[model samples]
Target: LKKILIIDQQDFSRIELKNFLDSEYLVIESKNEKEALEQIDHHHPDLVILDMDINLCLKLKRSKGLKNVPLILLFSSAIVNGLHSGADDYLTKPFNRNDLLSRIEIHLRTQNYYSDL
Candidate 1:
């Protein structure tokens, strides 16, 4: 099964994403960055969707597991703050579902395509 890790503080958002992706993707959802790191170590997920407000510096200091995962940051704040986090992709909250899915698929597909080559 394809694995995707979602890190958001809001429980409802996590559930909504899980329900939407459950049909085809294995979703690992976390309400905080710490748990997200733990899940990453255990799952080594294919994609990571995280809230841009997460304590990135602290989390990275806590563990190196999240070092290279392709991350997508979601935020509803000023775009500046979100873009500073060093993620592969950035989307504001209340994002379009189709865009999110397409981005995720593209990231995963691109990796697989290049890996095979």
Candidate 2:
């Protein structure tokens, strides 16, 4: 299965997302920048669904990986500052769960197929 890393501070959101991607992805959660970076280096997940608020700075540090690994930025609609960062795509919070899953799967599958991953 493909791997996905999610970095967010909320446990409920994490669980909800995990349940959504349960079988298709090897989902790993990180609550802080430090752990997120470590997981990125170790797991090299096919994609990362990031909570832009806490992980914006850390995501900027990952521009080098943008050419290879895909990233999906998750943020509240009220927060747009980091929406266009290095991430491949952005998803506003309170988004439909099906839409979220579709975005993740699209990025993951497309990158894998086109990039020979």
Candidate 3:
């Protein structure tokens, strides 16, 4: 199964997201930046879904092994900021389940295609 690391400060959001992805993927959660970075190093998930914090997001984008992992940002605002900082995509809060699934599918498919090259 593809692995995903979800980083969010909110407990409800983290659990809610894991529930959505758990059936199809291996889901991991981190409630803070420190844990998130550690999980990234240890788990090396195929993708990451995270809350908006441009500095942390940018730091992850620049990290060595994780630099190319697909990063999706969940943000109430700062959509452009997230993209500029290196998120592959951004979903506004209260996103539809189908929308989130579709975005994840697309990114994963795209990543797979590139990896095949």
Q: What shift in Å separates residue 74 of candidate 1 from its native position after superposition?
A: 0.6
Question: Relative to the true structure, how large is the alpha-carbon lDDT of every model?
Answer: 0.76, 0.74, 0.84
TM-score for every candidate vs. truth?
A: 0.83, 0.81, 0.90
lDDT, candidate 1, 11-117, per-residue tens: 77778888998887999988886688789789888878887545463454356565545778787744574435557788887889999999998988876877689
Query: Whole-model lDDT for model 1 versus the true structure?
Result: 0.76
lDDT of 2 by residue, 1-117 (tens): 888888888888878788878877788888877788788777777788888567464454544543566777787843355425666787778878888878887887798788775
Candidate with the greatest TM-score versus the true structure: 3
lDDT for each residue of candidate 3 in 6-39, tens digit (9 for 90 to 100): 9988888889999989988999999998899899
Give the residue spans of candidate 3 off by over 4 A: 81-84
Q: What C-alpha lDDT, on a 0 to 100 scale, does residue 3 get in candidate 2?
A: 86
Q: How does candidate 2 score on lDDT?
A: 0.74
